[PDB]
Amino acid sequence: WVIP
Amino acid sequence: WVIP
Amino acid sequence: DSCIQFTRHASDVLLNLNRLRSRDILTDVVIVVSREQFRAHKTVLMACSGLFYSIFTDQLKCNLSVINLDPEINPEGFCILLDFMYTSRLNLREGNIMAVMATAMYLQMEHVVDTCRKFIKASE
Amino acid sequence: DSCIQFTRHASDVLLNLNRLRSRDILTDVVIVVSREQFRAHKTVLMACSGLFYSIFTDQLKCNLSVINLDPEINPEGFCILLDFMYTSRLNLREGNIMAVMATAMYLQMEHVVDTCRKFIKASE
Ligand SMILES: O=C1Cc2cc(Nc3nc(Cl)ncc3F)ccc2N1
Ligand SMILES: O=C1Cc2cc(Nc3nc(Cl)ncc3F)ccc2N1
Ligand SMILES: [Cl-]
Ligand SMILES: [Cl-]
C-alpha cells in the first residue's frame, strides 16, 4: 500500500 | 514497454 | 517466453472498466445492501472478492441479476470497497475503518483486511 | 482525496480475469477470425480496443454473442493480441510482427501499433  |  | 510487457496496461484496463461502470455500460448485476443498490460487472466483482468468486461460479447463482448482501453490511463500507475494486484506491478514514474492515472480511478481500488491521493496530 | 492505493491491485485483477477466461467463466462473446473462434469477456475487449469499444457501445451490436472480424485478419495475430489484452505481455517475433501490427491497427490498440512501428524501424 502507498500514498498515490 | 519493458523486458518482464 | 520472449514477450515484451506494457507496464501501464493493467492500470489502463482497470481505468477503462471504471469508465464503463460510470457510464453504466455492460453492467450485468445489481448488488443490494439494504436500501441501496450498486450496479457492477460480475467479472470485476469475482476478480476482487472471494465471496463474489464463489457466488458467480455457482451454477444457479451465476444467472442472477440481483444479489442481496447480509443486512449487517454497511452500504457506505460496500461503496468504498466497490470503488477500490475499480480503482485500486481505498478511502480509509477513522470514521469508516471498522465498517470497511467488516465488509472486506465478509467479501473476502484479504489485502484490504490486512491494511485495516495494520491501521487499527497503529491507533492502539 | 486522502486515499491509499494497493500497487499490485490492477495487475492482480487482470491476472484473475485471465484465469476466468482460461476456465471459460462468464465469457459472453465469441470472436470469429475466419476458421477460428475465440471466447472472451466483452468488457475486457472494450477496455483494450477502440474497435470493440465502438462495437459493444452500439445499441444493436452490444447484444450479439458472435462477432465476425474482417476476413483479412490473421487468427494468430488476433490470438497474440487477445493474450496481450489479458496479460500485458505481447509475443512479438520477426515472423508475426507484420500480422500483429495489421491486427492492432484494425482493433485500434494504439500502444501495440506504436511498439510494432518502433521494432520495424529498428530492423530497417
Ligand atoms: O482476497 C481475495 C480476493 C479474491 C479473488 C478471487 N478471484 C478469483 N480467483 C481466482 Cl483463483 N481465479 C479467478 C478469480 F476471479 C478469489 C479469491 C479471492 N480472495
Ligand atoms: O488504443 C486504444 C485502446 C482503447 C480502448 C478504449 N476503451 C474505452 N475507452 C473509454 Cl474512454 N472508456 C471505456 C473504454 F472501455 C477506447 C479506445 C481505445 N483506443
Ligand atoms: Cl483485497
Ligand atoms: Cl494498446
Q: Is C94 exposed, middle or buried (0-12, 13-18, 19+ CB in 10 A)?
A: exposed
Q: How far is D7 from chain C (nearest CA, A)?
A: 7
Taking the Cβ of residue B1 and every Cβ of chain D, the question of whether any pair is shorter than 8 Å is answered with yes
Maximal C-alpha separation, chain A: 9
Q: How many CB atoms lie within 10 A of CB C123?
A: 7
Q: Which grid cell sits at C85? A: 475494486
Chain C residue numbers with beta carbons less than 8 Å from the beta carbon of A4 are 89
Handedness of CA C86, C89, C93, C97 (dihedral sign): positive
CB contact under 8 A, B4 and C6: no
Number of domains in chain D: 1
Looking only at the bridges linking them, the beta strands covering D4-5 and C89-90 are: antiparallel
As beta bridge partners, residue D33 has: D36
CB D105 within 8 A of CB D81: no
As beta bridge partners, residue C5 has: B2, D89
Question: Nominal resolution in Å?
Answer: 1.8
How far, CA to CA in Å, does B3 sit from each of C5, C59, D35, D90, D116? 6, 40, 33, 10, 15
CATH number of D3's domain = 3.30.710.10
Taking the Cβ of residue C6 and every Cβ of chain B, the question of whether any pair is shorter than 8 Å is answered with yes
Q: Please give the interface size between B and D, counted as residue pairs whose CB atoms are below 8 Å apart.
A: 3
CB contact under 8 A, D56 and C25: yes
In 3-state terms, what secondary structure has residue C7? coil
Q: Which residue has the cell 500483429?
A: D100
CB D44 within 8 A of CB D84: no
Question: Integer distance in angstroms from the first to the last C-alpha of chain D?
Answer: 48
CB C36 within 8 A of CB C71: no
Strand order in the sheet with C36-40: C36-40, C29-33, C66-68
Angstrom distance (rounded) from CA D39 to CA D25: 10
Expressed as residue numbers, the domain containing C5 is 1-124
Angstrom distance (rounded) from CA C101 to CA C24: 27
CB C31 within 8 A of CB D67: no
How far, CA to CA in Å, does C78 sit from each of A2, C23, C85? 22, 20, 10
- Number of helical H runs and strand E runs in chain C: 6, 5
